[PDB]
Amino acid sequence: ATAVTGGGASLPADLYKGSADSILPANFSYAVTGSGTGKKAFLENNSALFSTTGTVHFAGSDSVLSSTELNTYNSTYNVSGDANRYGALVQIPSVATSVTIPFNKAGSAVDLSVTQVCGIFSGKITSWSQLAGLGRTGDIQVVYRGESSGTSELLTRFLTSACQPADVSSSNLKLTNGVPAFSVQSTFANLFTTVPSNFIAAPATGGTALYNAVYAIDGRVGYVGPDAIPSLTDATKVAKVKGFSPDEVSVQATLETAAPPTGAAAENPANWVPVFGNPSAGYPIAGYTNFVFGQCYKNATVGANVRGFLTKHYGSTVVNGVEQGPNDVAIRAHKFIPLTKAWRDAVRARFATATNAGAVNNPATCSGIGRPL
């Protein structure tokens, strides 16, 4: 009967559940809500948000835990001397992902400059005719995620990092340094003093609904994770960005630029999720989608089920002489990017290995405590 209750981010939802090669065990549930609602469900232990009951055991999120979220959690659920405390939480990367730019406008292959992407998503560029050489005219309508979204966070971090003031001048973006500027927002609408009228919220929760809305009306552009895209390589439907399709992320210039944390740094969940807002090479919109777990669970089978999952997902196996994570074929089949060996080894050793003080349901650290039955 034992269930492991989760949900959150839509971006990795089909890798996790419902597909023949999905990677979560059968007794794990995954309610699709977007990352913001997913974080809240876990942090406030609120299963109503996942349309169910009992304890929330985990979330998927491509929005990082904030300073405020961590402090609120710690001061409520992980209080020094509190026999009723839940204990620490665990934030870990699951897979890396691109953010793709699907658009619905018939014609030749589209390759957008940073300037052009910045102009489209700021509202500076409002007509297809303003994009030189694409052979297209008519209104641009941008579809965005109304709910708090990890995909919005990944896209906006990139735009905040890469866009120059000249790329977004004469737009309704909130000011930074006296000029309109992108800022990091999981709520995309929060970028603007007033949302421009050619920006429309997707009509239902999740990236799949945004995707379908893009193709419902001519001239639309959106942003979505890669798994829902039928072909990442079809530049007549999924824009290249500075000469790169969204399967051309540079692993060297992104994942390999940060090593797993150690010591006190590893005790801080914030340090388990590096961000790469402006990669020096390759497709430039990319980052991690993550899990949030509890370190401690009063239900010991839930703890064991989590460790079991972690042992596989962050495992190591050599196949045809090449080291890989056990789930890497499934990860790539869902158009995601496997974690590097250093990161799998680090997560496995700390969180999945029951003898480590930092592991899920480590007997010493979790003695007498945990997320409730």
Short mmCIF file of C-alpha atoms in Angstrom, two decimals:
data_model
loop_
_atom_site.label_atom_id
_atom_site.label_comp_id
_atom_site.label_asym_id
_atom_site.label_seq_id
_atom_site.Cartn_x
_atom_site.Cartn_y
_atom_site.Cartn_z
CA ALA A 1 0.00 0.00 0.00
CA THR A 2 2.89 2.39 0.66
CA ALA A 3 2.73 5.46 -1.59
CA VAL A 4 5.36 8.10 -2.29
CA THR A 5 3.51 11.33 -3.05
CA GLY A 6 4.89 14.01 -5.34
CA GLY A 7 4.42 16.25 -8.30
CA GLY A 8 5.39 19.71 -9.55
CA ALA A 9 7.25 20.70 -12.69
CA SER A 10 5.62 19.70 -15.97
CA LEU A 11 8.97 19.80 -17.83
CA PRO A 12 10.23 16.34 -16.66
CA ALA A 13 6.80 14.87 -15.90
CA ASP A 14 6.77 12.21 -18.71
CA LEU A 15 10.33 11.07 -17.96
CA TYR A 16 9.10 10.53 -14.40
CA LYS A 17 5.69 8.88 -14.97
CA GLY A 18 3.30 7.51 -17.54
CA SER A 19 5.66 6.51 -20.38
CA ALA A 20 6.93 2.94 -20.97
CA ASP A 21 10.46 4.07 -19.98
CA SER A 22 9.47 6.39 -17.11
CA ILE A 23 11.92 6.32 -14.22
CA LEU A 24 9.93 6.79 -10.97
CA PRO A 25 8.90 3.56 -9.24
CA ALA A 26 5.27 2.50 -9.71
CA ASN A 27 4.23 3.56 -6.20
CA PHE A 28 5.46 7.16 -6.70
CA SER A 29 2.68 9.57 -7.74
CA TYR A 30 3.38 12.73 -9.78
CA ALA A 31 0.78 15.46 -10.00
CA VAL A 32 1.57 18.06 -12.67
CA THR A 33 1.27 21.58 -11.27
CA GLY A 34 4.25 23.61 -12.35
CA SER A 35 7.33 24.05 -10.15
CA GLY A 36 6.04 26.90 -7.96
CA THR A 37 3.05 24.89 -6.78
CA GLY A 38 5.30 21.82 -6.51
CA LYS A 39 7.75 23.59 -4.16
CA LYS A 40 4.85 24.91 -2.06
CA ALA A 41 3.27 21.45 -1.80
CA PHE A 42 6.50 20.05 -0.38
CA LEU A 43 7.59 23.05 1.73
CA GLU A 44 4.15 23.43 3.38
CA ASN A 45 3.49 19.66 3.32
CA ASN A 46 0.22 20.26 1.45
CA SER A 47 -1.08 17.37 -0.64
CA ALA A 48 -4.27 19.21 -1.57
CA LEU A 49 -2.11 21.00 -4.16
CA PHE A 50 -1.44 17.58 -5.71
CA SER A 51 -5.17 16.71 -5.57
CA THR A 52 -4.60 14.08 -2.93
CA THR A 53 -4.18 13.50 0.80
CA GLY A 54 -1.49 12.75 3.39
CA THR A 55 2.14 13.77 3.44
CA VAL A 56 3.90 15.25 0.42
CA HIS A 57 7.13 13.24 0.07
CA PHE A 58 8.79 15.05 -2.84
CA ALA A 59 8.56 17.59 -5.64
CA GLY A 60 10.04 18.06 -9.07
CA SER A 61 11.08 21.67 -9.75
CA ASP A 62 13.08 23.56 -12.35
CA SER A 63 12.78 26.63 -10.09
CA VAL A 64 15.58 26.75 -7.51
CA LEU A 65 14.71 26.96 -3.80
CA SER A 66 15.05 30.57 -2.72
CA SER A 67 16.80 31.98 0.34
CA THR A 68 13.39 32.84 1.80
CA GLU A 69 11.96 29.37 1.10
CA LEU A 70 14.95 27.71 2.83
CA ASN A 71 14.85 29.97 5.88
CA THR A 72 11.08 29.63 6.27
CA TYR A 73 11.37 25.85 5.97
CA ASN A 74 14.23 25.62 8.45
CA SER A 75 12.58 27.89 11.05
CA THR A 76 9.28 25.96 10.88
CA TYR A 77 10.13 22.34 10.16
CA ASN A 78 13.76 21.95 11.18
CA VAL A 79 14.02 23.74 14.53
CA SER A 80 16.95 23.09 16.87
CA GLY A 81 15.72 20.94 19.81
CA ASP A 82 12.26 20.25 18.38
CA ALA A 83 11.26 16.61 18.85
CA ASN A 84 8.51 17.18 16.27
CA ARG A 85 10.83 18.49 13.56
CA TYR A 86 10.79 17.04 10.04
CA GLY A 87 14.56 17.47 9.67
CA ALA A 88 16.51 18.84 6.73
CA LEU A 89 15.32 18.89 3.14
CA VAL A 90 17.30 17.64 0.13
CA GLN A 91 17.56 19.54 -3.16
CA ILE A 92 19.34 17.73 -6.00
CA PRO A 93 19.63 18.02 -9.79
CA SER A 94 17.82 15.26 -11.67
CA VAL A 95 18.68 15.88 -15.34
CA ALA A 96 19.77 18.91 -17.34
CA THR A 97 17.48 20.39 -19.98
CA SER A 98 17.25 23.00 -22.68
CA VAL A 99 14.39 25.46 -23.02
CA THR A 100 13.06 25.43 -26.58
CA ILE A 101 11.36 28.18 -28.56
CA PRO A 102 8.45 26.62 -30.50
CA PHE A 103 6.70 28.97 -32.93
CA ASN A 104 3.82 28.68 -35.34
CA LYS A 105 4.61 30.59 -38.52
CA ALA A 106 4.93 28.73 -41.85
CA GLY A 107 8.10 29.21 -43.87
CA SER A 108 11.87 28.70 -44.00
CA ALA A 109 14.23 27.71 -41.16
CA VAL A 110 14.38 30.26 -38.35
CA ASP A 111 17.58 31.08 -36.50
CA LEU A 112 17.21 33.89 -33.95
CA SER A 113 20.01 36.09 -32.66
CA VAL A 114 20.18 36.94 -28.96
CA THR A 115 19.02 40.43 -29.97
CA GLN A 116 15.94 38.97 -31.72
CA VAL A 117 14.96 36.55 -28.91
CA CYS A 118 15.36 39.39 -26.39
CA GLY A 119 13.20 41.64 -28.57
CA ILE A 120 10.42 39.03 -28.99
CA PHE A 121 10.15 38.12 -25.31
CA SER A 122 10.33 41.74 -24.12
CA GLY A 123 7.61 42.90 -26.50
CA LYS A 124 10.01 45.21 -28.34
CA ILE A 125 9.50 43.15 -31.54
CA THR A 126 5.82 42.80 -32.32
CA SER A 127 5.65 41.77 -35.97
CA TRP A 128 7.21 38.90 -37.88
CA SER A 129 8.14 41.50 -40.55
CA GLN A 130 10.67 43.01 -38.12
CA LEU A 131 12.75 39.78 -38.23
CA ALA A 132 15.05 40.23 -41.26
CA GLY A 133 15.16 37.45 -43.86
CA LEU A 134 12.49 35.15 -42.32
CA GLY A 135 10.00 35.98 -45.09
CA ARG A 136 7.12 36.33 -42.66
CA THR A 137 4.73 39.13 -41.66
CA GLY A 138 1.85 39.62 -39.20
CA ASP A 139 1.45 39.96 -35.44
CA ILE A 140 3.69 38.06 -33.05
CA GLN A 141 1.74 36.71 -30.09
CA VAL A 142 3.84 35.33 -27.22
CA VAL A 143 2.34 32.51 -25.16
CA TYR A 144 3.64 32.35 -21.57
CA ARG A 145 3.03 30.31 -18.46
CA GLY A 146 0.50 31.97 -16.13
CA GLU A 147 1.56 29.85 -13.15
CA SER A 148 4.88 29.88 -11.28
CA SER A 149 7.14 27.92 -13.61
CA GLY A 150 10.66 26.53 -13.63
CA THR A 151 10.73 26.85 -17.43
CA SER A 152 9.96 30.58 -17.04
CA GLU A 153 12.80 30.80 -14.51
CA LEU A 154 15.30 29.09 -16.85
CA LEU A 155 14.28 31.26 -19.81
CA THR A 156 14.31 34.52 -17.85
CA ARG A 157 17.66 33.77 -16.20
CA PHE A 158 19.12 33.41 -19.69
CA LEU A 159 17.44 36.60 -20.93
CA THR A 160 18.57 38.47 -17.79
CA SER A 161 22.13 37.18 -18.33
CA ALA A 162 22.44 37.59 -22.10
CA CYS A 163 20.24 40.47 -23.26
CA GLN A 164 21.87 43.90 -23.66
CA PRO A 165 19.99 47.09 -22.84
CA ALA A 166 19.83 47.96 -26.57
CA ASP A 167 18.09 44.60 -27.19
CA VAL A 168 15.17 45.51 -24.90
CA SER A 169 14.93 49.30 -24.99
CA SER A 170 11.44 50.70 -25.54
CA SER A 171 9.77 47.73 -23.84
CA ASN A 172 7.66 47.39 -20.69
CA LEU A 173 10.31 45.41 -18.79
CA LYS A 174 10.89 46.65 -15.25
CA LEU A 175 13.95 48.87 -14.91
CA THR A 176 17.41 47.75 -13.81
CA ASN A 177 20.12 50.45 -13.85
CA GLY A 178 17.72 52.99 -15.26
CA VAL A 179 16.70 50.90 -18.30
CA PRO A 180 14.24 48.13 -19.16
CA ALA A 181 15.78 44.77 -18.32
CA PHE A 182 14.93 41.14 -17.94
CA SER A 183 14.99 39.82 -14.37
CA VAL A 184 14.76 36.24 -13.07
CA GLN A 185 11.06 35.39 -12.75
CA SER A 186 9.27 32.08 -12.21
CA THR A 187 6.09 34.10 -12.76
CA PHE A 188 6.79 35.37 -16.30
CA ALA A 189 4.19 38.16 -16.10
CA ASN A 190 6.18 39.71 -13.19
CA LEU A 191 8.85 40.84 -15.70
CA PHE A 192 6.68 43.77 -16.84
CA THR A 193 5.37 47.03 -15.49
CA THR A 194 2.28 46.14 -17.58
CA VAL A 195 2.11 42.90 -19.59
CA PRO A 196 1.93 43.80 -23.30
CA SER A 197 -1.36 42.98 -25.04
CA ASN A 198 0.31 40.56 -27.53
CA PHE A 199 1.32 38.29 -24.56
CA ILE A 200 -1.25 35.62 -23.62
CA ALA A 201 -1.24 33.12 -20.73
CA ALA A 202 -1.48 29.50 -21.80
CA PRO A 203 -5.02 28.25 -21.31
CA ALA A 204 -4.21 25.50 -18.82
CA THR A 205 -1.44 24.43 -16.48
CA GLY A 206 1.76 23.01 -17.93
CA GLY A 207 4.09 23.18 -20.89
CA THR A 208 2.08 20.81 -23.07
CA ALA A 209 -0.93 23.14 -22.89
CA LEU A 210 1.35 26.10 -23.78
CA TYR A 211 2.78 24.13 -26.71
CA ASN A 212 -0.70 23.29 -28.09
CA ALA A 213 -1.77 26.91 -27.65
CA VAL A 214 1.24 28.02 -29.75
CA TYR A 215 -0.01 25.88 -32.62
CA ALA A 216 -3.66 26.90 -32.16
CA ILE A 217 -3.29 30.42 -33.71
CA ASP A 218 -0.95 31.55 -36.50
CA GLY A 219 1.97 33.76 -35.56
CA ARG A 220 2.51 32.55 -31.99
CA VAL A 221 5.80 31.95 -30.22
CA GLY A 222 6.32 30.21 -26.87
CA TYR A 223 8.88 28.53 -24.62
CA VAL A 224 8.77 24.89 -23.46
CA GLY A 225 11.00 22.05 -22.31
CA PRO A 226 12.29 19.73 -25.04
CA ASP A 227 10.49 16.46 -24.21
CA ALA A 228 7.11 17.72 -25.62
CA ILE A 229 8.71 18.91 -28.85
CA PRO A 230 8.19 16.32 -31.65
CA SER A 231 11.39 17.41 -33.44
CA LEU A 232 14.08 19.63 -31.89
CA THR A 233 15.81 19.84 -35.27
CA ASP A 234 12.94 21.24 -37.34
CA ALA A 235 13.89 24.91 -37.48
CA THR A 236 10.64 25.73 -39.40
CA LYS A 237 8.88 25.11 -36.07
CA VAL A 238 11.48 25.24 -33.28
CA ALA A 239 13.80 28.24 -33.54
CA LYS A 240 17.55 27.91 -33.48
CA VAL A 241 19.23 30.35 -31.14
CA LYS A 242 22.46 31.90 -32.41
CA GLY A 243 22.96 29.00 -34.84
CA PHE A 244 22.11 26.17 -32.40
CA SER A 245 19.15 23.82 -32.19
CA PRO A 246 18.01 22.99 -28.66
CA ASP A 247 19.79 19.61 -28.73
CA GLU A 248 23.14 21.46 -29.09
CA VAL A 249 23.74 22.40 -25.45
CA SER A 250 27.47 22.32 -24.59
CA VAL A 251 27.96 19.90 -21.71
CA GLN A 252 31.52 21.29 -21.32
CA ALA A 253 30.31 24.90 -21.12
CA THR A 254 27.42 24.10 -18.73
CA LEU A 255 27.29 20.95 -16.53
CA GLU A 256 31.07 20.49 -16.39
CA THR A 257 31.71 24.07 -15.16
CA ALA A 258 30.56 23.28 -11.58
CA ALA A 259 31.68 20.46 -9.26
CA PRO A 260 29.43 18.98 -6.59
CA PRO A 261 29.65 20.71 -3.22
CA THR A 262 31.48 19.21 -0.21
CA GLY A 263 31.50 19.84 3.54
CA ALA A 264 29.33 22.68 4.81
CA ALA A 265 28.70 23.66 1.17
CA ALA A 266 27.01 20.24 0.67
CA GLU A 267 24.82 20.85 3.77
CA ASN A 268 23.32 23.90 2.03
CA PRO A 269 20.67 22.69 -0.44
CA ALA A 270 21.18 25.83 -2.58
CA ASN A 271 24.62 24.60 -3.61
CA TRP A 272 23.31 21.41 -5.23
CA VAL A 273 21.77 23.40 -8.13
CA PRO A 274 24.29 25.36 -10.21
CA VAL A 275 22.82 27.74 -12.81
CA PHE A 276 24.25 28.58 -16.25
CA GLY A 277 22.55 31.76 -17.49
CA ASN A 278 24.98 32.60 -20.32
CA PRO A 279 27.00 29.58 -21.53
CA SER A 280 30.22 30.41 -23.40
CA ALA A 281 29.47 27.79 -26.09
CA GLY A 282 26.46 25.96 -27.54
CA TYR A 283 22.71 26.37 -27.29
CA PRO A 284 22.50 29.00 -24.61
CA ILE A 285 19.17 28.36 -22.75
CA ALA A 286 19.75 25.47 -20.35
CA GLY A 287 19.83 24.33 -16.73
CA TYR A 288 18.86 21.68 -14.21
CA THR A 289 15.49 20.28 -13.32
CA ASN A 290 15.61 19.09 -9.72
CA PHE A 291 14.09 16.97 -6.97
CA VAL A 292 13.18 18.19 -3.53
CA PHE A 293 13.00 15.37 -0.95
CA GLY A 294 12.96 15.20 2.81
CA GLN A 295 16.12 13.93 4.45
CA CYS A 296 13.95 12.15 7.02
CA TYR A 297 10.67 10.23 6.77
CA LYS A 298 8.77 8.71 9.69
CA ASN A 299 7.60 6.12 7.15
CA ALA A 300 10.69 3.94 6.84
CA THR A 301 9.53 2.27 3.58
CA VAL A 302 9.07 5.70 1.98
CA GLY A 303 12.67 6.48 3.08
CA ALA A 304 13.91 3.16 1.67
CA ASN A 305 11.92 3.66 -1.57
CA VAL A 306 13.53 7.12 -1.99
CA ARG A 307 17.04 5.73 -1.38
CA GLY A 308 16.34 2.90 -3.81
CA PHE A 309 15.27 5.34 -6.47
CA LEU A 310 18.30 7.56 -5.81
CA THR A 311 20.67 4.57 -5.99
CA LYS A 312 19.47 3.85 -9.54
CA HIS A 313 18.99 7.35 -10.89
CA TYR A 314 22.36 8.52 -9.56
CA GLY A 315 23.98 5.11 -10.07
CA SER A 316 27.01 4.21 -12.15
CA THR A 317 27.34 1.42 -14.66
CA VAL A 318 29.79 0.70 -17.46
CA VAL A 319 28.08 -0.37 -20.68
CA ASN A 320 30.10 -0.99 -23.84
CA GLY A 321 33.08 0.39 -21.91
CA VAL A 322 31.44 3.78 -21.32
CA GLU A 323 30.41 4.86 -17.81
CA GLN A 324 26.84 6.08 -17.53
CA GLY A 325 23.93 6.50 -15.11
CA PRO A 326 21.52 3.54 -15.18
CA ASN A 327 18.67 5.78 -16.44
CA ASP A 328 20.67 7.61 -19.14
CA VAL A 329 18.95 5.89 -22.09
CA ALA A 330 15.52 6.94 -20.79
CA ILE A 331 16.86 10.43 -19.99
CA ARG A 332 18.07 10.88 -23.59
CA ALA A 333 14.86 9.30 -24.97
CA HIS A 334 12.98 12.16 -23.25
CA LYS A 335 15.36 14.72 -24.91
CA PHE A 336 17.18 15.53 -21.66
CA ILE A 337 20.84 15.62 -20.73
CA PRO A 338 22.29 13.07 -18.25
CA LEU A 339 24.15 14.31 -15.20
CA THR A 340 27.93 14.03 -15.15
CA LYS A 341 29.57 11.17 -13.29
CA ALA A 342 30.93 13.52 -10.54
CA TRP A 343 27.42 14.69 -9.73
CA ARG A 344 25.86 11.19 -9.77
CA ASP A 345 28.67 9.88 -7.55
CA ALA A 346 28.25 12.81 -5.11
CA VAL A 347 24.47 12.45 -4.80
CA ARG A 348 24.70 8.66 -4.45
CA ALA A 349 27.38 8.81 -1.78
CA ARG A 350 25.73 11.50 0.35
CA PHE A 351 21.94 10.99 -0.06
CA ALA A 352 21.45 7.39 -1.25
CA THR A 353 24.01 5.59 0.97
CA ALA A 354 22.22 4.94 4.27
CA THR A 355 25.41 5.01 6.43
CA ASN A 356 26.20 8.64 5.48
CA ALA A 357 25.08 11.25 8.04
CA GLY A 358 23.52 13.20 5.14
CA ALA A 359 21.53 10.31 3.64
CA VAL A 360 17.78 9.84 3.44
CA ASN A 361 16.77 8.10 6.66
CA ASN A 362 20.32 7.84 7.96
CA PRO A 363 19.62 6.22 11.34
CA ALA A 364 21.62 8.70 13.38
CA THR A 365 20.57 11.99 11.75
CA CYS A 366 16.93 10.92 11.32
CA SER A 367 16.51 9.17 14.67
CA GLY A 368 13.00 9.84 16.02
CA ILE A 369 12.20 12.51 13.38
CA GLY A 370 10.93 12.94 9.81
CA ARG A 371 8.08 13.93 7.55
CA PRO A 372 4.86 12.58 9.14
CA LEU A 373 3.05 9.33 8.39
#
